[PDB]
Amino acid sequence: GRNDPCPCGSGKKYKQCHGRLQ
Numbered sequence: 454g455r456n457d458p459c460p461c462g463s464g465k466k467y468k469q470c471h472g473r474l475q
């Protein structure tokens with residue numbers, strides 16, 4: 454859903470930015 458809140462404000466990005474948790 455292009456939910457890249459954080460300081461990205463976009464889509465997909467966050468998953469690669471704040472989506473990974475390892």
Ligand SMILES: [Zn+2]
Pocket residue numbers: 458459460461466467470471
């Ligand atoms: Zn981010």
